[PDB]
Amino acid sequence: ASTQPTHSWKVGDKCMAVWSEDGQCYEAEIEEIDEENGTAAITFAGYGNAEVTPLLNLKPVEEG
């Protein structure tokens, strides 16, 4: 509705989602983006865990 993304994310991009179980940020790939709720279904690479987390929890992959 009035959800203005805090971070410009796209489908098929790598990000760092905050695991709702441990609370730490692991590497995850965006499979789907729901701008209606401001959330995005991400899948942690290597693990296989997929959860719907907001775009505010999605941090950029800082490798440099």
Ligand SMILES: Nc1nc(-c2ccccn2)cs1
């Ligand atoms: N099934 C499993 N998932 C994880 C995991 C770890 C970090 C982030 C997401 N998932 C570990 S074992």
